[PDB]
Amino acid sequence: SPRVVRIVKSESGYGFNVRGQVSEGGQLRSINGELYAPLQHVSAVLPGGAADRAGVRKGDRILEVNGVNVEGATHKQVVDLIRAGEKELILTVLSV
């Protein structure tokens, strides 16, 4: 089920990579049997980094960034939202 994680930047940034489509919207695809528009996802987690310690895992799909729904969002929208705070990030994620 979707869950919320709070992450504070360390020396190393947040310690994850985000990957997904450049465009908006597109073909529906279910995640764990729940229907969604395309979702950006976590493509890497730095061992021992902030995201790792918050329990973010490779493959986690990103549903919200800083309380903003990012279902179907562009990669730029998600990157810019991740950058909204000076040091804190809140994500709603879905593990696969």
Partner: peptide, 7 residues
């Protein structure tokens, strides 16, 4: 077309 960004 997908992009990856280091955060």
């Amino acid at each position: 077309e997908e992009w990856s960004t280091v955060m």
